[PDB]
Amino acid sequence: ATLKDQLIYNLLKETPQNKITVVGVGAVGMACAISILMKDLADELALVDVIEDKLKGEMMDLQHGSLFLRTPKIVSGKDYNVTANSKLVIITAGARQQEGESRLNLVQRNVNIFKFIIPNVVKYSPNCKLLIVSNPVDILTYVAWKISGFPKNRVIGSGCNLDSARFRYLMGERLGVHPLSCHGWVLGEHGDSSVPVWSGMNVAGVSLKTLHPDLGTDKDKEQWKEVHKQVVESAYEVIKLKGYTSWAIGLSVADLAESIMKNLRRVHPVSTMIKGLYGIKDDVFLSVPCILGQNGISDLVKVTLTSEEEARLKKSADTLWGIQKELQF
Amino acid sequence: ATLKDQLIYNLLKETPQNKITVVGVGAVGMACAISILMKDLADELALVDVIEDKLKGEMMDLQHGSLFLRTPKIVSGKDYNVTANSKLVIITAGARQQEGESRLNLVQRNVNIFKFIIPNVVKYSPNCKLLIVSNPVDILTYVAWKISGFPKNRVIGSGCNLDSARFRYLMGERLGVHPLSCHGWVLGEHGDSSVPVWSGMNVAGVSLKTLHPDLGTDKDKEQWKEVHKQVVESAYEVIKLKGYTSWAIGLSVADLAESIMKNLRRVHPVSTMIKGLYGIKDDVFLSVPCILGQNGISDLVKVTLTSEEEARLKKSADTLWGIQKELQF
Amino acid sequence: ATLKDQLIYNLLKEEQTPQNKITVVGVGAVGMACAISILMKDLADELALVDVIEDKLKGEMMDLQHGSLFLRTPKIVSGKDYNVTANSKLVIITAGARQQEGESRLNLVQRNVNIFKFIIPNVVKYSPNCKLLIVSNPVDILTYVAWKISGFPKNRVIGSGCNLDSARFRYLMGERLGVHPLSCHGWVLGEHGDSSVPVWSGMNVAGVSLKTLHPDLGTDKDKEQWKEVHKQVVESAYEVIKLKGYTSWAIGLSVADLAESIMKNLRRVHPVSTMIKGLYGIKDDVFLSVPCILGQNGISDLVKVTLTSEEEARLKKSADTLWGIQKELQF
Amino acid sequence: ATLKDQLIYNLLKEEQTPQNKITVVGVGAVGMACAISILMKDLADELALVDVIEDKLKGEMMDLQHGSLFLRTPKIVSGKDYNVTANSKLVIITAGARQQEGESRLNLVQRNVNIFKFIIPNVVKYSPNCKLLIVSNPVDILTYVAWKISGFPKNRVIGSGCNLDSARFRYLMGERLGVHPLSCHGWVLGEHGDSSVPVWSGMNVAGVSLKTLHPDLGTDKDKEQWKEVHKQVVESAYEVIKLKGYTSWAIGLSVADLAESIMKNLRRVHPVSTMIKGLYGIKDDVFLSVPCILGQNGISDLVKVTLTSEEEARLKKSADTLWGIQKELQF
Ligand SMILES: O=C(O)c1csc(-n2nc(-c3ccc(F)cc3)cc2C(F)(F)F)n1
Ligand SMILES: O=C(O)c1csc(-n2nc(-c3ccc(F)cc3)cc2C(F)(F)F)n1
């Protein structure tokens, strides 16, 4: 005789079918959350962090916008049981490099955090895809793969996905064309060591390198190499200006989530286990174009690289392995 | 010739059709911006604020996500020339009240702030609609109206649009129905003095007040009055938990922008000049259900209120006019 | 080494079942309008089409496939054999005879019950866990039939019902008031057909009761003749059939609206055909439209609408008409 | 007072001109597929439909209006009189004569000229600043016809051209490679249909040239017969026509993609038909497809694709063939 019962005759006393979890509710985690919500990718969104008030506040702020969304359940908690049955778990938590801190010790601190996060995630969603966004993303994708025990197709790092998107943005600005119609790939290690593959840059299938052979070289009077320099530094420039980056990474991560959740088999440059390619013999993750879908990475595109490009990926792999073999799991 | 000229033959060396400006790039302003971008409402987005570094960093972060959007131009600056020819200008900038500072003094500081912002907006977009999101929104909508010289249809306050969305969310939680199918209106002055119109709360046209006469009274065993208390205290609780609120207000503003930009003539509870209704005789703005379209507010719905509800709106109007008549423009 | 081999290194060999497959049965105008609407709303990762006319079927499938670049549904299949429908979450039935000019939907019963005797066991055979969404006419009777033949629990057998009649009512309401239909609220319940019931006592804008403002609303004495709005709703399909030969776009959008609530588990309320036994003192197993909560398990709840004496009498008249047919069917 | 005036206080009497209006001319299968695709992509705040068959036109308009609840395009209008199209940003022409048994290409085009002599001036009268998007076949010649009659500058007269051929090519390429067509790049240029030119040099996934990986790509001696993909781009259209009677859905989706770039000023590149005199040794006023930057002023720029000698010869032969017909037309 409650109001609910006077109004509603229940037929069914009835698990989520398209659930995504975001771990970490810093600026990056919440940018991923809002972008996923506005793209209607999930029927349930779970948020996890260790700061309880901030977590609850973010969950409530999203819930209050429910009228404008098509995601009918948003939940959160410090307890990983709220993440149960996720198709996709996006990891954005972890430690930032501090003053005086080595890359090795920063990574070790993140190993120690992932040793708590990842087994809890795996416990409640043993068949999920893990999408690692935390930096340094290539090494932390390896760390998540090692700790989770997942097959390599289900452990994906966001890698050079945004680097590539920035590259196409800058390309489009130079040419006066939408980035959607400007094509070009940044591969390898995310960050300062990434590799712009000049041979693949094109508009409508017309090779810029063929039209303009000095493209990307020191002799280039248009200094197109400065485009890749800008890609590397634009992250730093945004951090210097507003303190951090968030929006572009959130959009780029939602794009990856779309391909996975909707089984699109679109090709994205993400970090994946690259052993066996380009002379690399160690268990390291680097960005190459991957086909993304329901089972994670199902296929790799084998981009033809020059000797110099290949040597740069090899050099990155050697460094990554050099750090990885010193980690304590 | 340059690479561009070898690649591209230009036919035309020829103004935005659907431009939106957001003034203020704090958390609320940026939530409005990302929500508008992800809803494909604008062909150009302009951001303005007085903090030049933050401003440029936010613009760049959004620009870097261009590949994932359908808004081909994002601009920013401290100079309002970047806002030229906007259809819709959303104001989120304003003062924060100081300890010991009277409400009157606070509003006067907002007046002085708007005496800079609004004339510069009007210079560059004389035919825009103004959407005021800054709190205290009902008074500041009056202030924008007076300073702009705009007809009242083109000056809209976000008002109780989000309070009503929160109400419907809470209603939906109690009933197990999506908020889209839970109907109910919070009207009047945004904040603690707002009015939940119990007579209008329904699912599928079934009045809850009819089924449950004690609805919203102190005699209510189900304590539905707590739902409106929760609405009123929501921003408070979220601010206490995470420091501020942003996502819900961004989504609600993007919903208002959708009706305006697409000429939908949907009904929203927004703040509008209410002189002539409910025995109100002064130039005050409060929320009532308004028809929103390409000319702003073209019509408003005359909601039948109980004597108590009417008295509350009247008391709010008296309080608003008491402050407004002391303002120096 | 083939070109594909040189270009792509494969990690995973095994293809998996789709997560969100939808089947549309029947590729007439209604079925194809449902298909394009569902495709453009991104509700499925696989769309299957089934019909008995093989050329037309293959042609429609290819036409949609050629638009794949512009869609986000990576697999579209078709076949006369129902094995192409396996593992569907939602199966939308649009097949069967349709109304000619001036013809009642009720005139289609014999033809479409006989088609359903073939279709429904084949659907259930390949997707035993699907939700059935019945669109073929007369939709209320055929929803009862699909429920009886399938042996499904009634929550998983949903008729498109009066979702469309209510959409038309709200459109006409919006035209009269100068308000978008989204903000005009009014329900048409009962048969999707001539005996439908407008619930005047529930109509409102912004929670303001129109019958309270206008006590003659929906009566013969009404100086504004709002009954004409419901009369236009009843006559809509006839008028469109007379003009263009059939209806398609509005029903396609109505069905996609229902599919969205089901596939995304929204628990939005829609007037759809379901068993109303136990409401308004009705004891028969009659199916007709009342507001239902719709989600991933189909109909999980009924909203109990308070009707005036006249509205309830009209709804019971509608139920008597439909039950007079449904009771005589033989399974 | 009326119920409306009791309920609603009016602030504004608005005589306001459409801000984002699209007109579709012709309400056959192609025109209505363009209409529904545009509606479900929210590209327009007003949609106008025009044709000469009045009952069919009214029926289509009503069927779309009845689905308004499910749309975000608040005004849908129609009429045989072109005053309903006034102030359109974009006018899509799908109307025209269909080729009859035994009829020459010249006679078919001339019948379309005669129809365009009615349609095009009426469009120009009411929307003198619109972009014209020609979809009627044969599209390259009728884009020329529309250009000559309208007297528009060539940036504002666009033929749908090889946009759909390229989409079909990418669908077929994706099927072969097991990759979404969004990630399979390849351009079909030149004359729409049988004489179109697949640009093998541009075919790629992730910037990896297939022709560089597989030098036989596109040739007769190719063991993998990739040339068959382009043969199927040509043949699959005829196959759809044979099987269901006509093509409609893929055209509609591809036209809505073009509309999206134009209405939202995206400056995306599309292979559309444009006046090509001065390129590739072409010296006549003919329209052929090349990659064009599309935005609010129509075609603002075009991409200069490097073609082999064989590819250039094929464009010239098409240009001679088209000009061969155009020079015989009576305007
Ligand atoms: O053994 C250790 O050092 C250890 C074990 S857990 C841990 N974690 N975990 C988080 C965390 C987890 C999830 C989030 F969503 C966000 C943050 C933060 C830390 C801390 F700051 F390093 F302490 N450290
Ligand atoms: O070719 C090799 O094996 C090789 C090439 S560089 C290298 N590096 N680099 C570092 C290092 C760098 C930065 C630090 F802050 C701290 C340590 C340490 C080593 C080493 F393995 F111990 F040798 N090894």
Ligand SMILES: O=C(O)c1csc(-n2nc(-c3ccc(F)cc3)cc2C(F)(F)F)n1
């Ligand atoms: O928005 C972006 O792309 C972004 C935001 S921070 C970032 N990071 N983070 C690291 C890093 C962090 C810790 C290490 F121990 C080592 C490296 C390097 C980069 C960069 F790509 F080079 F910029 N990138």
Ligand SMILES: O=C(O)c1csc(-n2nc(-c3ccc(F)cc3)cc2C(F)(F)F)n1
């Ligand atoms: O800042 C740091 O901690 C840091 C920065 S590079 C680094 N490296 N690098 C290598 C390496 C590199 C190349 C090789 F060919 C072989 C090994 C090994 C390490 C170390 F053990 F972690 F120290 N450490």
Ligand SMILES: O=C(O)c1csc(-n2nc(-c3ccc(F)cc3)cc2C(F)(F)F)n1
């Ligand atoms: O006393 C009352 O309020 C009352 C009780 S029944 C009633 N009804 N019922 C119908 C009706 C019923 C079924 C139809 F199929 C058609 C019409 C018409 C009326 C009315 F008189 F016009 F109001 N009114």
Ligand SMILES: O=C(O)c1csc(-n2nc(-c3ccc(F)cc3)cc2C(F)(F)F)n1
């Ligand atoms: O003098 C002539 O031959 C002539 C002059 S107008 C004409 N038109 N026009 C249309 C038409 C127009 C717009 C549509 F949207 C659809 C069709 C059809 C014909 C026709 F009768 F079939 F030939 N013919």
Ligand SMILES: O=C(O)c1csc(-n2nc(-c3ccc(F)cc3)cc2C(F)(F)F)n1
């Ligand atoms: O869906 C499509 O692509 C499509 C649908 S009809 C079509 N048409 N139309 C003609 C044509 C028509 C009249 C002529 F007088 C001459 C030619 C040729 C083609 C074709 F591309 F080769 F297939 N294409």
